[PDB]
């Protein structure tokens, strides 16, 4: 699975 | 930062006369990801080419494989023509059939 989107926010 | 694509051209199987195969052109180590890579026979774009989705390595440099089904005819020139910002002019990498 991939990670929660928010964890890619800069 | 923008470094040059390193290009190889090879076939799936060791090539023989009249025998189906796949021609491959792999480019790696480049940036930016915009790149033109065209498989060619005797100066003409080959038809069934498939392009891998944009991917990269751990040093962040990008890579792409382009492959097409083909049957190599002896006395033809097969090559991979590559465009990229890092290059003044298109580079043409010749395939060695090895038969």
């Amino acid at each position: 699975r991939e990670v929660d989107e928010q964890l890619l926010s800069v | 930062m923008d470094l040059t694509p390193k290009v190889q051209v090879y076939s799936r199987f060791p090539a023989s006369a009249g025998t189906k195969n796949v021609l491959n052109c792999f480019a790696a180590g480049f940036h930016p990801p915009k790149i033109s890579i065209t498989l060619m026979k005797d100066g003409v774009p080959m038809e069934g080419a498939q392009y891998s989705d944009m991917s990269f390595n751990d040093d962040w440099t990008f890579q792409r494989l382009v492959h097409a089904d083909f049957t190599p005819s002896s006395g033809s020139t097969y090559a991979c023509k590559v465009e990229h910002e890092t290059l003044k002019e298109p580079q043409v990498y010749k395939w060695d059939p090895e038969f």
Binding site: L7 | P14, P32, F62
Partner: protein
């Protein structure tokens, strides 16, 4: 046995012709198993083993998560552009995430981003902080210190990542553990006799391989030129090593191929 899960994301302003500006590709033990891009707008299976061991709930779930990821990375391009004083132009955000279950059984975890091909941020699980590589990443570190992001990722890297990696490895144990022997060819070229000797291994799996040339038994490696290891279309691998020899020394040289599918190393000569 070493196992790896990697998720590999590229958001770009200039893709370009006919190509998607955002792609996300997932790998298990180096093998491409999931795919998303901003044209399909669908998270999609890429091996038969993952297709067979997942339903539509899984791909509906991954689709929403990666669709939101795409939107997060649209915003990311615009925000980093401002922080770097840029306007328009050709730019990229790259995000790598995943985990390793090592042979000794230890877990490793990765979460890192690059802007225009340069380190931007990396997670440091040891110290439990997001490291900013350049001043342009300090506001991101600030964001993670406040938003409570670090704990949510610890969960991902230490649990979710590894648990699913173990599942995936299980789903495709036979496929991942398979052996495909290389077809090897030796070919020589130029001048009077036999100057350059080529050794090509075609269609091997798994990826690791050592191909070397032997002049009367002696490994001439500082002399060998290698292409490294490159992919075929069908999931197998390719590699070539060349060596330069005086013409007519052809008979002295032997190509040695060490690979997991070969119980004894393979030995090849020039014809």
């Amino acid at each position: 046995e070493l196992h790896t899960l990697r998720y590999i994301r590229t958001a770009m302003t200039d893709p370009g012709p006919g190509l998607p500006w955002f792609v996300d590709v997932g790998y298990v033990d180096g093998e491409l198993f999931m795919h998303y891009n901003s044209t399909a707008r669908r998270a999609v299976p890429r091996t038969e083993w993952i297709a067979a061991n997942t339903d539509q709930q899984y791909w509906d779930r991954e689709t929403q998560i990666v669709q939101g990821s795409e939107q997060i990375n649209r915003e990311n391009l615009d925000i980093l552009r401002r922080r770097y004083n840029q306007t328009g132009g050709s730019h990229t955000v790259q995000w790598m995430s995943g985990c390793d279950i090592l042979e000794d059984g230890t877990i490793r975890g990765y979460h890192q981003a690059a802007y225009d091909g340069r380190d931007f941020v990396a997670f440091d699980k040891g110290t439990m902080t997001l490291t900013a590589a350049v001043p342009e990443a300090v506001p991101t570190k600030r964001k993670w210190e406040e938003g409570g992001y670090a704990e949510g990722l610890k969960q991902y890297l230490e649990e979710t990542c590894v648990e699913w990696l173990r599942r995936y490895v299980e789903y495709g144990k036979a496929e991942l553990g398979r052996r495909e022997r290389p077809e090897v060819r030796v070919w020589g070229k130029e001048a009077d006799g036999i100057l350059t000797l080529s050794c090509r291994a075609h269609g091997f799996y798994p990826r690791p391989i050592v191909v070397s040339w032997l002049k009367d038994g002696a490994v001439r490696g500082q002399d060998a030129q290698s292409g490294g290891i490159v992919p075929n279309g069908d999931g197998t691998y390719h590699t070539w090593v060349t060596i330069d020899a005086q013409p007519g020394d052809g008979d002295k040289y032997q190509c040695r191929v060490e690979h997991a599918s070969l119980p004894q190393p393979g030995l090849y000569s020039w014809r």
